[PDB]
Structure formats: structure tokens, C-alpha cells
Coordinates of C-alpha atoms in Angstrom, one line a residue:
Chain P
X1 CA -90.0 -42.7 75.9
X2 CA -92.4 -45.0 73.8
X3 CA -95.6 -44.5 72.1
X4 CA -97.1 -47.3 74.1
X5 CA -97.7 -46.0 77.1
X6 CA -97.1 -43.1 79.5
Chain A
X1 CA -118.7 -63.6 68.4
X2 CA -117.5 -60.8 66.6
X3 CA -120.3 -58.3 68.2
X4 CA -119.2 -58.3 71.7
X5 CA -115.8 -57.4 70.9
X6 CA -116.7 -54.5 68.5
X7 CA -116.1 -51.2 70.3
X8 CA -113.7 -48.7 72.2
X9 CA -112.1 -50.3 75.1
X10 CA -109.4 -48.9 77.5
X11 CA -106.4 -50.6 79.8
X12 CA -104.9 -49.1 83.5
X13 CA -102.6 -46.9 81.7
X14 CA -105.1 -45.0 79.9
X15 CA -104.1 -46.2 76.3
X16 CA -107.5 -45.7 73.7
X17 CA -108.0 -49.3 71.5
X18 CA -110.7 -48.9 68.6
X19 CA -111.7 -52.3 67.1
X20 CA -114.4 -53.8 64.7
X21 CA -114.3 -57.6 64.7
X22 CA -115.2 -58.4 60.7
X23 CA -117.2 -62.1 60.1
X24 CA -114.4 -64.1 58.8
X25 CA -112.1 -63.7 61.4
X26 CA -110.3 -59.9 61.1
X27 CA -109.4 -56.7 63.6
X28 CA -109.0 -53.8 62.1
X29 CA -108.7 -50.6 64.2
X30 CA -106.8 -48.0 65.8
X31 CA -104.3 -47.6 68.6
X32 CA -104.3 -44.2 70.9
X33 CA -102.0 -43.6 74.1
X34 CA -103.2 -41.2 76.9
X35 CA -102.3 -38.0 75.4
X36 CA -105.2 -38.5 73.3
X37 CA -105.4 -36.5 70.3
X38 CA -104.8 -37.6 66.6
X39 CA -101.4 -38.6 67.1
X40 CA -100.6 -41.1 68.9
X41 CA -102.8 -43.0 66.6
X42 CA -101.5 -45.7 65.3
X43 CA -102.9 -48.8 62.8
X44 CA -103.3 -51.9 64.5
X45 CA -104.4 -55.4 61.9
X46 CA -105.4 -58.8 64.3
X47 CA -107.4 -62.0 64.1
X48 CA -109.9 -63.6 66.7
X49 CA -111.5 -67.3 67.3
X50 CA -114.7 -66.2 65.3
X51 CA -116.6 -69.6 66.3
X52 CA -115.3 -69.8 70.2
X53 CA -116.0 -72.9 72.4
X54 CA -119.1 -73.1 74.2
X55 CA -118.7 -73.3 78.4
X56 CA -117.4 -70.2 79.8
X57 CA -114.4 -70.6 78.0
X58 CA -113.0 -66.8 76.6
X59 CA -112.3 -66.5 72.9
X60 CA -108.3 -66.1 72.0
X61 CA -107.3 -63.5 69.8
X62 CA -103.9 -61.0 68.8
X63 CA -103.2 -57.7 67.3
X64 CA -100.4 -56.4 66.0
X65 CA -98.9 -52.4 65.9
X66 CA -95.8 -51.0 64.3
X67 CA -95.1 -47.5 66.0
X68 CA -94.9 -45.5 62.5
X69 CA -97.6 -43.1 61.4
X70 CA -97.5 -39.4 59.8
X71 CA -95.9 -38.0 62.6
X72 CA -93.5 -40.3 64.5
X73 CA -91.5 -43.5 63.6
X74 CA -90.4 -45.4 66.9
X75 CA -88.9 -47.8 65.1
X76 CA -90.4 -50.9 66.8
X77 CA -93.8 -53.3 66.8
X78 CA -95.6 -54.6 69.6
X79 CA -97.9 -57.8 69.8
X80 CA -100.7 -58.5 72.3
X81 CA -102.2 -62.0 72.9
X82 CA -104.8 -63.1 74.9
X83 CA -108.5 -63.9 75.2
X84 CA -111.6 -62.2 75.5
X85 CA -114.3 -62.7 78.8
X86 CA -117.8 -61.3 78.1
X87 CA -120.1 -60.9 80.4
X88 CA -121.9 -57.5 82.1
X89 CA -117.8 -56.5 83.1
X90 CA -116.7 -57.7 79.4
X91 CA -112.6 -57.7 79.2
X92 CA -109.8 -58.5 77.1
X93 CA -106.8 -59.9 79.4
X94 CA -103.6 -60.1 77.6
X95 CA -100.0 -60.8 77.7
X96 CA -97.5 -58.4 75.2
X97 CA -94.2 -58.3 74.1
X98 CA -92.1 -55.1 72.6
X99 CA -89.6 -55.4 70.1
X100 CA -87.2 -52.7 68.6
X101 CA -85.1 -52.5 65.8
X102 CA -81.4 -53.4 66.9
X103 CA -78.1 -53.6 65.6
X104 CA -76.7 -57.7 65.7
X105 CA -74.3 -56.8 68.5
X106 CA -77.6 -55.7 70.6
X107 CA -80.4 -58.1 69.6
X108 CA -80.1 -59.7 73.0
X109 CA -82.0 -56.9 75.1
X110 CA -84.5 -56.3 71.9
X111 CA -87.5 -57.6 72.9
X112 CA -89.6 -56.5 76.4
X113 CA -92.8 -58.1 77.9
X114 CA -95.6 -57.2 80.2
X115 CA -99.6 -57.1 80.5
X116 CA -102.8 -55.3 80.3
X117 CA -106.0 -55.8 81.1
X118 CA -108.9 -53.3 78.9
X119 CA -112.3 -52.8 80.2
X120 CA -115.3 -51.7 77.2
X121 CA -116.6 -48.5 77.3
X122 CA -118.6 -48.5 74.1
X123 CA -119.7 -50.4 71.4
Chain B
X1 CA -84.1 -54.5 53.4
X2 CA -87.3 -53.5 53.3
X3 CA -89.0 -55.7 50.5
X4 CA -86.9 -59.0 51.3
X5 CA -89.5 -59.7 53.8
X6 CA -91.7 -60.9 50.8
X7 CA -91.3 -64.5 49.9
X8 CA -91.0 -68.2 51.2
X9 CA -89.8 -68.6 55.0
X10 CA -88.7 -72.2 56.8
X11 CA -88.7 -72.5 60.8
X12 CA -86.4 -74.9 62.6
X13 CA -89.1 -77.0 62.5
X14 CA -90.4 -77.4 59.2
X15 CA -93.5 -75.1 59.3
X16 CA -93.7 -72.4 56.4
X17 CA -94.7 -69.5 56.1
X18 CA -95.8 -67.0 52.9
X19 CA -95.5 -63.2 52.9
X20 CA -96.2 -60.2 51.0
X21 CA -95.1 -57.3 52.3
X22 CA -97.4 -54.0 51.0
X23 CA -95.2 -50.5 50.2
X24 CA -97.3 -48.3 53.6
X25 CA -96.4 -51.1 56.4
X26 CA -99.3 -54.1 56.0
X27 CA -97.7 -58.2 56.5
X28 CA -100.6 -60.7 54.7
X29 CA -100.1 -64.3 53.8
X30 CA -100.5 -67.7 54.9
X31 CA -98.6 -70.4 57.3
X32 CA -98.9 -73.8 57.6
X33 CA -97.1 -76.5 60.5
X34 CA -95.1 -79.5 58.7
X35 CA -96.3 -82.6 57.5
X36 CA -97.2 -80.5 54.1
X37 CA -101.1 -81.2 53.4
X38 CA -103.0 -78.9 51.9
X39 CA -105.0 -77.1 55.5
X40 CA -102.4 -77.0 58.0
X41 CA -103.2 -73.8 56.1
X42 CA -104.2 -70.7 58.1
X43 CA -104.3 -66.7 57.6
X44 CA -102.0 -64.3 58.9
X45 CA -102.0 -60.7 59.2
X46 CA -99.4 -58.3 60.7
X47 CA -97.5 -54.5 60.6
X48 CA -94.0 -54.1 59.9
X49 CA -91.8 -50.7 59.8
X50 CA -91.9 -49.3 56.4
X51 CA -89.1 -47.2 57.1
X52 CA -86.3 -48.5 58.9
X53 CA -83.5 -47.2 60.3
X54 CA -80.0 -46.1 58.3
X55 CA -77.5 -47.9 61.1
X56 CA -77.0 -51.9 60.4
X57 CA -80.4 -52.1 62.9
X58 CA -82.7 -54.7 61.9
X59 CA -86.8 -53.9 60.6
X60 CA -89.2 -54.8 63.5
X61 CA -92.3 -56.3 62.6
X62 CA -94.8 -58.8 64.0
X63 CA -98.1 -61.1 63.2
X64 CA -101.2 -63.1 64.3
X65 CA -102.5 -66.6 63.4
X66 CA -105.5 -67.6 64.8
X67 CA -106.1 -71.1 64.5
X68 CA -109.0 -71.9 62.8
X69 CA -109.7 -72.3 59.1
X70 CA -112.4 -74.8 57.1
X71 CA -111.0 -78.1 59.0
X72 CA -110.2 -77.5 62.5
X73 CA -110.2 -74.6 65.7
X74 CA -107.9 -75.2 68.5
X75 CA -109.4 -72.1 70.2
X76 CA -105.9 -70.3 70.2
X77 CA -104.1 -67.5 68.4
X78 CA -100.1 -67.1 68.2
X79 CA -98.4 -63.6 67.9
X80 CA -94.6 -63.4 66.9
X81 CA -92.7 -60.7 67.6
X82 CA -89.2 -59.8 66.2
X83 CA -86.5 -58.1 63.4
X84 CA -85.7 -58.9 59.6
X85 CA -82.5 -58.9 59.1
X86 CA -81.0 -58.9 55.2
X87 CA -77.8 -59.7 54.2
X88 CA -76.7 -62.8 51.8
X89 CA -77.8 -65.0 54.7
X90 CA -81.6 -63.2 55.3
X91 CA -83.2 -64.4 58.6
X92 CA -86.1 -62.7 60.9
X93 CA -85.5 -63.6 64.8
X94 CA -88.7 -64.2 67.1
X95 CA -90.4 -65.0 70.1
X96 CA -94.1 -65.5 70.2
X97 CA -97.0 -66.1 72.8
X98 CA -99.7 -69.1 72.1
X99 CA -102.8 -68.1 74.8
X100 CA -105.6 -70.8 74.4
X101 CA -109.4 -69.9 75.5
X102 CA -109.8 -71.1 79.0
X103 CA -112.6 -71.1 81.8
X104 CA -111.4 -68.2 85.0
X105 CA -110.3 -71.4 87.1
X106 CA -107.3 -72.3 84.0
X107 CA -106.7 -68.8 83.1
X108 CA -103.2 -69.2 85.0
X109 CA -102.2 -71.8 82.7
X110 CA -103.3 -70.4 79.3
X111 CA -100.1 -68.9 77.3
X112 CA -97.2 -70.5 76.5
X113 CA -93.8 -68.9 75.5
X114 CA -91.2 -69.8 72.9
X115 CA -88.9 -68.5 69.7
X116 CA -88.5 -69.6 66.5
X117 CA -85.6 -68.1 63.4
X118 CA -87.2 -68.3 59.5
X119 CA -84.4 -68.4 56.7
X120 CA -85.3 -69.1 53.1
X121 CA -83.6 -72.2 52.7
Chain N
X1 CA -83.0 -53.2 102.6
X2 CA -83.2 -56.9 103.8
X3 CA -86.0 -56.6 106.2
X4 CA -88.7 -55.2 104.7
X5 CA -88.7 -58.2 102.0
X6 CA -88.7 -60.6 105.3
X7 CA -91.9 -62.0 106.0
X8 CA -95.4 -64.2 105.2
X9 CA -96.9 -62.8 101.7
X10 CA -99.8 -63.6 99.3
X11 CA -100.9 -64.2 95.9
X12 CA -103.9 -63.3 94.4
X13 CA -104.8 -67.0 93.5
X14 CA -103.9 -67.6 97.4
X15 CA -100.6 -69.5 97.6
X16 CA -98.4 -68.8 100.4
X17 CA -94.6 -68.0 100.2
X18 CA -92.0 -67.4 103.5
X19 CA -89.1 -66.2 102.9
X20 CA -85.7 -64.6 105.3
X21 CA -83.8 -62.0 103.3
X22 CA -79.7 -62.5 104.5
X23 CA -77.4 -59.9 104.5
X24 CA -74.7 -60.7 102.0
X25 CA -78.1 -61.4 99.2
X26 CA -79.4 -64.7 99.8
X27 CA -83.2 -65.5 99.8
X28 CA -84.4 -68.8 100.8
X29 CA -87.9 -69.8 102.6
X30 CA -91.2 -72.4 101.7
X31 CA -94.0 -71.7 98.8
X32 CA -97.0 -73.3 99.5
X33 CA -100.6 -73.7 97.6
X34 CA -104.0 -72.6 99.1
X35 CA -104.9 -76.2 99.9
X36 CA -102.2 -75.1 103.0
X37 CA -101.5 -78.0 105.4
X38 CA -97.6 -79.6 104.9
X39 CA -97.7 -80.9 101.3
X40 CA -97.6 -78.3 99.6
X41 CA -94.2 -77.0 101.0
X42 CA -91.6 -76.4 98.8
X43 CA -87.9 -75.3 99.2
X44 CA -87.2 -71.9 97.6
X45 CA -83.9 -70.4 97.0
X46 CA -83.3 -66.5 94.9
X47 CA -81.3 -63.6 95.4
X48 CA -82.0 -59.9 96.1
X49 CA -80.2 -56.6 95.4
X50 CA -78.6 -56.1 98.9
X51 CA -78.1 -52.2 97.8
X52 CA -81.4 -50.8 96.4
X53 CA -80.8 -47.0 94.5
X54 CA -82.4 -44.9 96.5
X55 CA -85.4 -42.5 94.6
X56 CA -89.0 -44.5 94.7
X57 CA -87.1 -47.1 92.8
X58 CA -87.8 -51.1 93.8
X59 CA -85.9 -53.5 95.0
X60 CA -85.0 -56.4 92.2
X61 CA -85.4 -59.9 93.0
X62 CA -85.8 -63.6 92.1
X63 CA -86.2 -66.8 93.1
X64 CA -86.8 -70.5 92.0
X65 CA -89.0 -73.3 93.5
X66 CA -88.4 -77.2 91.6
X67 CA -91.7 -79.0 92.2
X68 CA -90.6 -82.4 94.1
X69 CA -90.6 -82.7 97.9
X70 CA -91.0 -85.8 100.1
X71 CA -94.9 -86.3 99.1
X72 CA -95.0 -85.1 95.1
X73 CA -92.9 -84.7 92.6
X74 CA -94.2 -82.6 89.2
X75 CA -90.9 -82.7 86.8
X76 CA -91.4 -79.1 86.6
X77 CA -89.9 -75.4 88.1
X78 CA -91.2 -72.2 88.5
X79 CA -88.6 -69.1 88.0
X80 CA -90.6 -65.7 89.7
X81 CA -88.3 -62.6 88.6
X82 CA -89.7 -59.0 89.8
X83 CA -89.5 -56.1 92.1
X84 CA -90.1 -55.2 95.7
X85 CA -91.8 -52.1 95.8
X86 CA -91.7 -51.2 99.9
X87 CA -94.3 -48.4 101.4
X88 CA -97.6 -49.3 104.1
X89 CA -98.7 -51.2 101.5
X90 CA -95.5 -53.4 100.3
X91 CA -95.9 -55.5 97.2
X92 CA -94.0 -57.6 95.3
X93 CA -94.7 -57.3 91.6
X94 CA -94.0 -60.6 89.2
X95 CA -93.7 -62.4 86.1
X96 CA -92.6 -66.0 86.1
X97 CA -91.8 -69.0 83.9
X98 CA -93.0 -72.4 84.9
X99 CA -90.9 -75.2 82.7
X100 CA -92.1 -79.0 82.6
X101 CA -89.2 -82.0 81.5
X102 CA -90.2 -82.7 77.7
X103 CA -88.9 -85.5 75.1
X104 CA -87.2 -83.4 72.3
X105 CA -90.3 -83.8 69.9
X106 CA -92.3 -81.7 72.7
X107 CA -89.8 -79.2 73.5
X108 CA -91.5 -76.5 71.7
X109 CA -94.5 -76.3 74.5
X110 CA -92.7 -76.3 77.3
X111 CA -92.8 -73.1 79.3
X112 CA -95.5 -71.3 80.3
X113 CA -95.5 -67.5 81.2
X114 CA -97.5 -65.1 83.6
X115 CA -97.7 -62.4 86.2
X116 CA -98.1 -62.6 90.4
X117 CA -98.8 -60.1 92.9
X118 CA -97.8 -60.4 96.5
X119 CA -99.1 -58.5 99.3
X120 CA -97.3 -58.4 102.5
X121 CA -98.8 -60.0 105.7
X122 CA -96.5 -60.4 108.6
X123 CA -92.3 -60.6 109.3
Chain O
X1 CA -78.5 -87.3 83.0
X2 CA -78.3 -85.8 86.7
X3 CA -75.1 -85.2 88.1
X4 CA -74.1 -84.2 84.7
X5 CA -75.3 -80.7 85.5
X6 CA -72.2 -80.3 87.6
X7 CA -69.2 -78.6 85.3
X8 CA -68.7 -75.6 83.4
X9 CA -71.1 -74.1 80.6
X10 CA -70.8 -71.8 78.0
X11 CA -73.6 -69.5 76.5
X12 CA -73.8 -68.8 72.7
X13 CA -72.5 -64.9 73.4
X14 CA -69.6 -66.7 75.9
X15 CA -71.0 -66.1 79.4
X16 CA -69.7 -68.7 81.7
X17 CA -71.6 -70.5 84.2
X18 CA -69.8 -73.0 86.7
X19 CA -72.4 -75.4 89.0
X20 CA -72.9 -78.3 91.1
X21 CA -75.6 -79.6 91.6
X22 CA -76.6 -81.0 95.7
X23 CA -78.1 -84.7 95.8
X24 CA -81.4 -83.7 97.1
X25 CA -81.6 -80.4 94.5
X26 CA -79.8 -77.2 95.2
X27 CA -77.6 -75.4 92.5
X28 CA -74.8 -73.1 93.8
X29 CA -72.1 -72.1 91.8
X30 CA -70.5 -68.5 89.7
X31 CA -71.6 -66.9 86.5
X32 CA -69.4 -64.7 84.3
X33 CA -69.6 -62.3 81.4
X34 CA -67.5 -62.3 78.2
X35 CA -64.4 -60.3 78.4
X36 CA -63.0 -62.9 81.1
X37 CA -62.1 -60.7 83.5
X38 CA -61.7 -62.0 87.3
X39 CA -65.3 -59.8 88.3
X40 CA -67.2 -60.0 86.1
X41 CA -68.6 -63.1 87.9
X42 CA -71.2 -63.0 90.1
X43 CA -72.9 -65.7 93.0
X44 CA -75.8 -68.4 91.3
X45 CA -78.5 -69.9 93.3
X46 CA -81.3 -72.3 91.9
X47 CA -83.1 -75.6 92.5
X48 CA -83.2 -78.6 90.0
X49 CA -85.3 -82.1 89.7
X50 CA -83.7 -84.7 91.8
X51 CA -85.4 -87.5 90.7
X52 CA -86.3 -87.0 86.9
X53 CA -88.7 -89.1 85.1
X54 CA -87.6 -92.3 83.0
X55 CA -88.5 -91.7 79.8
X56 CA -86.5 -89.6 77.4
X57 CA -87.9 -86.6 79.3
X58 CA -85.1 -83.2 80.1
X59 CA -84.5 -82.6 83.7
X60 CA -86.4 -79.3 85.1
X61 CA -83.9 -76.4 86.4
X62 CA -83.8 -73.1 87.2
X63 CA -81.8 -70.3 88.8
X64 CA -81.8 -66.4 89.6
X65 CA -78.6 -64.0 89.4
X66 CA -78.8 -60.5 91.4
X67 CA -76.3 -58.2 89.2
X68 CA -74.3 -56.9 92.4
X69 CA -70.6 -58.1 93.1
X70 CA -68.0 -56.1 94.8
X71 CA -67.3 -53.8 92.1
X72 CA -70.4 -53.0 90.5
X73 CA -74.4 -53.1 91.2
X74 CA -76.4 -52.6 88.1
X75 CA -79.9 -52.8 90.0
X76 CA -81.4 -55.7 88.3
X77 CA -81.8 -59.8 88.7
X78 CA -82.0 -62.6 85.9
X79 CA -84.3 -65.5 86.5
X80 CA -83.2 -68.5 83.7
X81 CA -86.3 -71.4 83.6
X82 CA -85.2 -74.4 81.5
X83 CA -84.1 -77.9 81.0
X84 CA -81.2 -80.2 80.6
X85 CA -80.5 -82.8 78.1
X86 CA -77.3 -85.2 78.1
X87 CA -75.8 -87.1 75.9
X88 CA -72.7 -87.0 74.0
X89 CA -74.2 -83.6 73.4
X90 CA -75.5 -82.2 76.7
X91 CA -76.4 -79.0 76.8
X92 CA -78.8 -76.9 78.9
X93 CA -82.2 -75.0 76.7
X94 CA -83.2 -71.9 78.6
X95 CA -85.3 -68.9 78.2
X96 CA -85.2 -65.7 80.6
X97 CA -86.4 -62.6 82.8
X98 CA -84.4 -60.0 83.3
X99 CA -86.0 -57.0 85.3
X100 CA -84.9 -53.7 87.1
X101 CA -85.8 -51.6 89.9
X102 CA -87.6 -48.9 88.2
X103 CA -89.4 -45.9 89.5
X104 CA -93.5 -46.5 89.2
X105 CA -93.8 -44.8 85.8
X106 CA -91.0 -46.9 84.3
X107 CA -92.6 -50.3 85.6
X108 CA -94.3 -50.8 82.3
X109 CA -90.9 -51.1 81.1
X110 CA -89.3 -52.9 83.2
X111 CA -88.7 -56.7 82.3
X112 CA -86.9 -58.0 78.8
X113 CA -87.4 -61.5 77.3
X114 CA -84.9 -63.4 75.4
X115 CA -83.2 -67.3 75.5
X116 CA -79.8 -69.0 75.8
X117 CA -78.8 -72.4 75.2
X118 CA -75.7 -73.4 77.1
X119 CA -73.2 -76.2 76.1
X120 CA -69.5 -77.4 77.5
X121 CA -67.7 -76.4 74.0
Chain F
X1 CA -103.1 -80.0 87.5
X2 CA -100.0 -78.5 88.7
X3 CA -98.6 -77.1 92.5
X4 CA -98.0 -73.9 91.8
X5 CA -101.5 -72.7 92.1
X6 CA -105.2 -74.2 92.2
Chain I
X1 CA -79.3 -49.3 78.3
X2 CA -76.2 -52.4 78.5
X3 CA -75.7 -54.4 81.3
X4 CA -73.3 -57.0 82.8
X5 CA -75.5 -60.4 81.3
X6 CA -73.3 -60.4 77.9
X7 CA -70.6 -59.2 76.8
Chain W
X1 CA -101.8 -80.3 74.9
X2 CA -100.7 -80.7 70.7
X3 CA -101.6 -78.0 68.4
X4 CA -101.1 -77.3 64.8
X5 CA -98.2 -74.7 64.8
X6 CA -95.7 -76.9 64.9
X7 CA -95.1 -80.5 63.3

């Protein structure tokens, strides 16, 4: 997963 | 002019920008996704056109964020560019790319791209 | 590692570009294009990861120039986007996006694409 | 699947592309601008994944269109590279690359980047 | 200069690419990873400028690559936008898209960004 | 100007 | 993630 | 175009 989105 | 961009603003995935555009030129803010909540907060440091063109040109700015704070360290920075429309619907349309950290043997699949387009919602 | 970021940095085509790196994650500095004179000078700000990974992976980082300063505006702003990488032979690998301010009708048109490597020599 | 991606489809700006998906993989068709009429048909040629995962997953695809027919000629090509996301409402999601012929002094500016959506009309 | 398109090409990682290039513009030919191994190719189509301009100018190319063959299908195409240069060095600058078939919530993630300059050494 | 789009 | 472009 | 990033 990323921080940048959902 | 530095006013107009000044405020909270928010793209189609829900992600929370804070901003204030300083007189010389500077952004200086903070990043949020969806979740909400402290964090997911993140520092962000950018620069716009503080003396943009006349006609109803938009004014070109960029922002940087590494995804490190006191809680989480994703190991990567992402950089949006693109330009700034005021008007009653003001928006900031830009274009971004992704990298992450890689060893040399991976460096080719490093870097992804994409857009997002954030309405205002508050000064 | 970590603090080789700070220093002088070459592109493949002559433009430079001045660094410090600060201890928390913070890139400041200035970059100028070729040709040398004193005000193909302009700012820069950026973030960087201040604490990298223990595999051989390279430190991502990133910046913004907007292209104005007390001579000229080309109403445009570059980011750059890519890993430090140390070694004997240092070098940081990017690719960057150049969006000009256009009317709605050009707003197709407005970003160009690109990539550039810095070394210290 | 092959026909689903077969058809007449639109762009937001209002450019026109055909296109006949083949069995084996093979995309090929006309892009045209909103001005319509004859001359501003192009040949196309692109691939598809012939075998799409199941799940809600898309369809990948891409295609290229080099800017010279019988009437014009630009120097230029555009590369659209995306995904066919099939349901009522089909749509083909894009980003693209347009790249102009440049001496080597100008090579540095010579692709531009950006996004297209396409929304399906008629096989 | 035109038909010097037509041969075989080698990317700085050594993929292989084998064209020719039509009178009137088409591209068709095979593509190959590293490793050399007889399927790890995969079928090339694209379009070209026919009729480039006369001044020092690059000829305008492009073509797209769906990663399915008879062995494996890895859900994804690769678009390459670029230009070729001759000489007694030709060689072939590109940059590219590469993007899978993801699930909705993934399609923020979808495409990479990167560039490959091909050459017949 | 360029084809791909007005 | 890997893939079939390189290597 | 022409711009100052570069040369």
C-alpha cells in the first residue's frame, strides 16, 4: 500500500 | 497571486493538501490521505509563479513530499506539477510522478505517474 | 549515503546545481542552465528520505524550480523526481515534468517530459 | 474479450477514434480530430491483451498514430497506453506521449505527456 | 535516415528488438528480453514518419507491445514514443508507458515511467 | 497547432 | 512486482 | 518554445 492514496 | 492559492484543498481520492503561498515565491504545508487523522501527515516544501501572466493564463507551480514522518517511513518521494485556475470553481490540475528507493538491478520499474485534479474548500 | 547529497552536481548538459541537504529531510539550494552568467540562477526547494534503507537501495528525493528570479519568468516550474545513489562514482537518476501556464484551450499541450543523471564531475 | 473494445469512441476534447479488435491481438482503425470530415484520418495500429484476468480487472492496451497522411504531415507521433475498463458504461482510460522530430540541440523538449478518456459510442 | 530503421536493436539492459519498417509507415517486427531464450519474444506493432523533414531533424516513431506470447501473459502493454537518429552512430532515443490491468482501487497505481535508448552494438 | 486535438 | 520488459 | 533549464 502507499501513503498517497487509498 | 499568493492569496488565491492559500487554503485546504482536496483531489477525487480524498487526499487533505494544506498550503500557505509565502510573497517571494514558497509552499509550505501539509499532506493528509483519506484516513484523516494526524498521521498520514506528511511535510510537503514547493514554489509557485508569484507574478503570473495576465490573460486567463493559470499560474505553474510544484511540491514536493518524502513519505517519512514520526510514524511511518515509505521509503519514497512524490512530485506534483502543474498550474493553478482561479475563478468561482478555483483548481489546481496537475500531473505527478512516484519514485521509490531501489536496488541498481531494479531502478527500471522505480518511478510511477499519474494525475489529480483538487478543488478548494477553504482559505 | 545520506549527506553525499550536499555539494556541486553537473547534468548532461551543463546546467548545475547546489545542495545542502538539512539532518530532518529538507533539499535547499540553487540551479542555474549553462552558458555560466551570474542569473541563470534560480531557487530550489525539495524533501529527501532522511533515513534510508539498509539493502544497496538508493535514497529517493525530489525538488521544484520555478522559473522566475530578478531578470526573467517563463511562467513554468520543473519537478524532478528520483534516487541518490553513493558509491566512488556518486550519481542521482531523474525524470522531471516542465508544465507552463496556459489559457483552457492549450491546457493539452502544457507539460513536457524528460530525465536528466547529475554526477560531481 | 475482443468485442467489447470494437467500436466508435470519444475524447473529452472530441476527437474520434475506430478501431476492430482481432483475435490473435491486433488493433488497427482511424483517429480523427473534432474538425471531422476526411483530413483528419489517421492510420492507427496497437495491440491488446487477448486474455484479460478475470476479477473487475481491465483490459491493457496500446496503440500508436504517426501524424502524416495524404493531406498533412506534422513530423510527430502520439503513443496512447491504458486500460479498457468494460461495464454499461465502458471506458477506456489513458495516458499518452506525443514526440515531435528535433535537431540534437532541441532534443531535451521533445515529448509531451497527458491523460485521455474514451467513452464508448457504437460497435 | 529512413529505411535505416530496418535491423536489429539493442537496449542498454540487452532487450532485443528486430524491425522493418513499410514504405508508406508501418513497423512490424519481434521484441525480446535478456536471458535469450527462444520466448521470451513477443509481436511489435507501430507507425513511423515516412517522409521526414530535411533539416537535421530525428524521424518520429512509435510502437506498443502487449506482454502475452504462448507461454506467458503478464496482463500489461508497453507503449515506446521516440525518435531515430543515423549516422555512423544510429541509434533510436525513447521514453515509455508501461500499464496493467488493475482492479479500480489499484488504478492510481497503475502506469510506470522510465526511457531506453536503443543502438545496433 | 497540432492534429491530435483542437 | 518484475515483469518480462528486462531482464 | 526555449526556456532557461537547459543550455
Amino acid at each position: 500500500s502507499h501513503p498517497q492514496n487509498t | 497571486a499568493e492569496a488565491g492559492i492559500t487554503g485546504t484543498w482536496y483531489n477525487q481520492l480524498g487526499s487533505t493538501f494544506i498550503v500557505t503561498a509565502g510573497a517571494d515565491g514558497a509552499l509550505t504545508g501539509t499532506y493528509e490521505s483519506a484516513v484523516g487523522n494526524a498521521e498520514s501527515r506528511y511535510v510537503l516544501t514547493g514554489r509557485y509563479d508569484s507574478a503570473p501572466a495576465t490573460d486567463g493564463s493559470g499560474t505553474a507551480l510544484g511540491w514536493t513530499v518524502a513519505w517519512k514522518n514520526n510514524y511511518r517511513n515509505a521509503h519514497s518521494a512524490t512530485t506534483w506539477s502543474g498550474q493553478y485556475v482561479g475563478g468561482a470553481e478555483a483548481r489546481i490540475n496537475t500531473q505527478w510522478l512516484l519514485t521509490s528507493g531501489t536496488t541498481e538491478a531494479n531502478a527500471w520499474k522505480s518511478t510511477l505517474v499519474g494525475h489529480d485534479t483538487f478543488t478548494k474548500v477553504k482559505p
